[PDB]
Design a protein around this ligand. Structure first.
Ligand code: CYZ
Ligand code: CYZ
Ligand code: CYZ
Ligand code: CYZ
Ligand code: GLU
Ligand code: GLU
Ligand code: GLU
Ligand code: GLU
Lengths: 270, 260, 260, 270
């Protein structure tokens, strides 16, 4: 019996092939996550068919209803059996599903439009309004926001640190709304905001976008915390230990580093 | 009922209190792992007695005996209940004990006594003039042992067939040896350990290049134990809250006894 | 009894003189191959009639049909007696035809339009901005297909899985494309051919990096023939006497129609 | 029936290891040729026993006796059946044995003591007295000679080039004798001659000596000839074609380049 692997349409984890109007099956998508699924199936024998969640959300908890949605939400309800997707490992998700050991290090970073080149002897220097989260919280002339129903929204929602509390208090009463449904929408907002917008996203997508054309955006500051990407699995499933072992095996041989280099730096430019 | 805890004497993870002859119990130990164990006990609600394994090795498998030494051995043979210590998560140990979610990211890093013609691992393997070594019975010598890369295989062959034995019993002795070797030694060790060593006086050692790979530190637990899930939840909540980052800064960058 | 000699129209190995329409016989052909064949005919003592293959292919195996094309095909199938031409010695040809000792060393070279940003082959493979290709139905392509190195395999996938077809029927058209690509095309070809192209006007191409591997040009003879040993002896005598070096200098650097 | 492998004790092809007094069998010798023979026997299955010729000569034909000595000499008479050694391919040699395709590229180079660095603005440069062989022929104050009963001496004997004829004319009447018995003897004469002597040898050993400590010698000029090292085999033997195919395979997979790099450049003491 074949199992369904749920994934989110995000780059460079899963991208649409140029020739995909006629292709069918698992050959429709390319990226990091499809390679990870291929290696998982090579380490342990099973037939997998990738799918994309209709909602398109990573997964969070709704208010006053306590119903899980998104990738995690449909993984709890049994319509999916494994989520090989860039899903962060969180305490709220750890109490409802089983998470394998992280296969990708990440952190909340700062995304800003690349500032222009200051002419002043003829050397070329780079300056940026934002160099840390503290100064972004202090300043107000540049707006900032996160991705709706993601992991960073939950991180700022339940943070007792003073600076993160200030950022969250600014975010909840932001007029107009600052959150974005997709990473691409937030990136486009940074692109067309004339430097009047800061994006809070995971470091992996941030560096991939920085090293991709037209590369007019760059990351400043530092990682606000340390988290990881894990392979989801429903509670009481016979796949958690094999997938955990497979991730450990891939880490030991170094396949994960090879895929990261191939899909992050090998296709870079500028 | 009390809980038996096993750890190792490694800095800045577990150290000995300056005034420890006049103190008894758990008050004579301080460091990252001691505070971590205190918070884990607070979140779970159990009394724990911190102990140090009589053998000062982390744990491995000896030559053709199928016996676990170090902390993992005390964990599998009923001598221990939980090990909050710098125990790297690897495949081989995942089949004998339970690993919680990692609480400290790390990677294999090089360090030399202060042009730097040691830029990364490629030329270091290609340069046999200066020797190098790893910790015996740890997670690094085994990492080199079962690596399928050609460069890492060459490094393993050069490490095993070297006169004299470049392996060192304890990382402190290896640090001393590389400090007294006048640049004729590069020590392979974890990123956190190397950063802590290079961040203290006399600051005559530096980390160069980047990590050879990425790994983490896990709170080990005997297989099929009722404490694995509670400690995993405790690590998750401490990482979400940010206390782990606070302890990392407190025991790595707070004393600041050097200029960098 | 005359001897059929096969070859290809490749510069500077074979030239069609300058007024070939006014000449007939083997007197209308000049170049390294023509003079070399003259010397072999003088040493062995046989009359030969130089011919050009109908389809100017060096030799390859087609799509799972077990058919030899080009000069090697004309040799195995009885259409030719001996090949004096730039025929690289490789594994597959040795099993179907007899090779003499190499009379010209060679290697895989990188050619670009006029510090190079690529130089080494690994650097060229890592950068996908500049496309590259090989000569179809030759030895370079086959060398790339059977290469087991990761870099060379990724190269082979790069030229094979590219849009449009980077492969070119003749090395002359590839050289023209490189000169017309404004530095966006690197052509992979033999060191001798690349050096000859560079040495000629308008001197808008240069050779960067080293030679990827070790090959040579052999004089092809069909399997189990009586002319393999005499031709090998003639090649050895010419190499010892130094006529090969003089011919290479005369047809590669004697003209010197460039500033260097 | 095990096949006897005849070789010559020359570096870096065959060198004695530090722990060789107690070792026995093929493990006594380590170097380029020994692992080349190992790969040859791995490609085509046979059992090989390593041996070293008692005479220690590469091989040549004496005058008025028509008796072949050295490695080729003992190979012709039948006491050996294959030779994985740095043996050059020559017309006189191939007339009696069946060589294989050249597994190494070689030429005749010039060996000279490395001159001192010239003081004069503070840039440090180096100069050589005689770069090309022509200058060595015109010059007389620095002596030069080949290796006795080798390929270089044979080539100079039968050379028709004017400069090479002049060099041979000088060598044949050298007082005292200029030819050296072993490559090590020629190198030592170069070191102890204070720059008064020049050595003629194949480029491979010249490169090895240049890149080996204390690296007081260097090679000037280009490559006078262009020859190669082939695997010897008695005329009419059945091992010729398997050896040729194995050499071609090793060249094609890149093994030969790996051995050259790991026995010539990898131990870069200088
Ligand atoms: N270089 S990277 O961010 O793609 C990356 C990140 C990580 C990797 C492997 C790679 Cl390649 N493995 C580790 C895993 C290995 C074992 C120890 C920690 C987890 C379990 N997690 S990680 O530290 O999140
Ligand atoms: N900054 S650090 O090295 O002290 C550090 C490193 C890490 C932390 C927390 C901290 Cl504070 N948590 C993560 C864990 C949290 C959840 C997401 C990945 C694992 C499960 N592992 S980690 O990426 O190895
Ligand atoms: N200088 S060159 O490229 O024209 C050149 C190259 C070579 C020549 C002769 C010349 Cl002139 N002969 C050798 C052959 C001669 C004998 C020794 C090696 C083979 C058999 N092959 S080679 O090393 O490929
Ligand atoms: N890199 S090198 O000079 O040691 C070198 C040089 C050469 C090698 C192998 C090596 Cl390792 N093999 C080739 C051989 C392969 C086939 C084609 C030419 C001969 C037969 N000759 S070569 O071009 O003279
Ligand atoms: N990848 C994150 C959400 C994306 C983001 O943080 O921008 C998650 O798994 O929740
Ligand atoms: N964290 C390692 C330490 C040993 C090493 O650094 O090699 C272990 O537990 O084995
Ligand atoms: N002349 C080569 C082919 C040309 C090329 O590969 O560029 C041969 O003998 O096969
Ligand atoms: N190797 C040469 C002899 C000269 C030398 O080794 O320097 C030969 O095969 O004859």
């Amino acid at each position: 019996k074949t199992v369904v692997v749920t994934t989110i349409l995000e780059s460079p984890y899963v991208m649409m092939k140029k020739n995909h109007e006629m292709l069918e099956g698992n050959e429709r998508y390319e990226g990091y996550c499809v390679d990870l699924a291929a290696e998982i199936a090579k380490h342990c024998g099973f037939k997998y068919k990738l799918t994309i969640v209709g909602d398109g959300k990573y997964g969070a908890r709704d208010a006053d209803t306590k119903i899980w949605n998104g990738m995690v939400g449909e993984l709890v309800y049994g319509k999916a059996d494994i989520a090989i997707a860039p899903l962060t490992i969180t305490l709220v998700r750890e109490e409802v599903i089983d998470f394998s050991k992280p296969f990708m290090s990440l952190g909340i970073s700062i995304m800003i439009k690349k500032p222009q080149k200051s002419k002043p002897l003829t050397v070329e220097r780079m300056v940026s309004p934002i160099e840390s989260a503290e100064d972004l919280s202090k300043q107000t002339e540049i707006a900032y926001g996160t991705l709706d129903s993601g992991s960073t929204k939950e991180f700022f929602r339940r943070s007792k640190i003073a600076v993160f509390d200030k950022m969250w208090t600014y975010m909840r009463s932001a007029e107009p709304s600052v959150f974005v449904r997709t990473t691409a929408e937030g990136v486009a907002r940074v692109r067309k905001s004339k430097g009047k917008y800061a994006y809070l996203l995971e470091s992996t997508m941030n560096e991939y976008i920085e090293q991709r054309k037209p590369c007019d955006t760059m990351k400043v500051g530092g990682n606000l915390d340390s988290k990881g990407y894990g392979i989801a699995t429903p509670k009481g499933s016979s796949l958690g230990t094999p997938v955990n072992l497979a991730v450990l095996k891939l880490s030991e041989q170094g396949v994960l580093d090879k895929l990261k280099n191939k899909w992050w730096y090998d296709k870079g430019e500028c």
